[PDB]
């Protein structure tokens, strides 16, 4: 993992958005890693196009009509090579993805629906007793640095 954060900061400030965004980021990176694995072995365009199409329409009555039937072949390859890092999904402000959609997206990428995986201690090597939520959070580096203070 790249950042370790204190759980005791969530249930007292009521940023459930943190946890939901973390689960959603894990789902998006799972889809991106699946696409990257498909692209590494240079599979044919048919199955890659089918996977992209099946990934895009997932949802519950979503107002998104991206279809790759009208998409050019080299354009499809460019799209895959562009989002190989992760499918950049977006949720508008007050009508977003519910837990059902997030869990469905996680299940598409062969990931636990609960969003929590088991972790091992880096130094001792013993498994952590409880599952831990591992996800991707978008972090900002603020302009209050040290050398200026």
């Amino acid at each position: 993992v790249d950042i370790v954060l204190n759980p005791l900061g969530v249930p007292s400030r009521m940023n459930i958005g943190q946890i939901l965004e973390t689960h959603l980021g894990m789902a998006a990176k799972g889809i991106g890693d699946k696409i990257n694995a498909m692209l590494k072995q240079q599979q044919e365009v048919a199955k890659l196009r089918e996977f992209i199409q099946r990934a895009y329409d997932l949802g519950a009555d979503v107002r998104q009509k991206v279809d790759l039937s009208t998409f050019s072949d080299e354009e499809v390859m460019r799209l895959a090579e562009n989002l190989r890092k992760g499918m950049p999904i977006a949720t508008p402000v007050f009508d977003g993805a519910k837990e059902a959609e997030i869990k469905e997206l996680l299940k598409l990428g062969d990931l636990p629906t609960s969003g929590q995986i088991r972790l091992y201690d880096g130094r001792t090597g013993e498994q952590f007793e409880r599952p831990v939520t591992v996800g991707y959070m978008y972090m900002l580096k603020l302009n209050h640095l040290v050398d200026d203070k």
Partner: protein, 248 residues
């Protein structure tokens, strides 16, 4: 310094300074505009009988204080009728449940209440108001990094914020790109539209490392490679902290 129930569609209820100036400084909502005299107005969709139409009326405080206004998060049929016979509404600075025919106006979108600063927070409805305020006021202090990185999860509002900020180079009337360099982009316009006589091509001189007000860097790198068609309003160079025309 308090949130008046008339701040609904005109002034953001979340974003504001914290300590001294709490509530004395505001940020306009995303759809709010100014009347001829200078009173804030917000747009609504007209309701005729039980069907909602696509006509948009701009209403001020006084005019909206009399009608009955529906809610954006209300289920809508295929043709335009309200699915439910009872609809949540605001009558006069309040809220209640009205009949399917008693409504007069409908909210246009769910982002109307909030400004543009707090519209880029995913899952805003799952945050406490104080923490949303802190996040909104702290997103403005981020610094541009070495390599811009798109957000893996967002609210789609990145495109408008990035393009409209004037920090990116958008092709005004471009055709097909001809010469791409680390500092210059020369585009040859399409045959369809020209100014008669003397022909013409578009030349954009990107601004390289330049001191900003807070002693940060301002940089522009092209995103088009060569021979790439470019439509009107396309994004050719991304300024500081923006990836392919998306705020990052």
């Amino acid at each position: 310094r308090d949130v008046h129930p008339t701040h609904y569609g005109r002034v953001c209820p979340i974003e504001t300074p914290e300590g001294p100036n709490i509530g004395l400084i505001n940020s306009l909502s995303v759809y709010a505009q100014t009347n001829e005299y200078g009173f804030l107005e917000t747009p609504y969709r007209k309701v005729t009988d039980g069907v909602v139409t696509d006509e948009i009326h701009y209403l001020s405080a006084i005019e909206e204080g009399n009608y009955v206004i529906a809610q954006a998060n209300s289920n809508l049929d295929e043709e335009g009728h309200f699915v439910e016979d009872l609809v949540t509404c605001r009558s006069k600075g309040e809220s209640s449940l009205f009949s399917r025919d008693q409504v007069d106006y409908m909210d246009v979108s769910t982002q109307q209440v909030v400004s543009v600063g707090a519209s880029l927070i995913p899952f805003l409805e799952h945050d406490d108001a104080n923490r949303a305020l802190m996040g909104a006021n702290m997103q403005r202090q981020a610094v541009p990094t070495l390599r811009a990185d798109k957000p893996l999860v967002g609210t789609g509002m990145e495109r408008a914020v990035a393009v409209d900020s004037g920090v990116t180079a958008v092709a005004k009337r471009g055709g097909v790109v001809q010469y791409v360099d680390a500092s210059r982009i020369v585009i040859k316009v399409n045959e369809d539209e020209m100014y008669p006589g003397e022909a013409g091509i578009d030349i954009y001189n990107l601004t390289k490392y330049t001191r900003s007000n807070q002693n940060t860097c301002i940089n522009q790198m092209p995103c088009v490679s060569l021979g790439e068609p470019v439509e009107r309003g396309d994004v050719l160079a991304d300024g500081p902290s923006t990836d392919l025309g998306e705020l990052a």
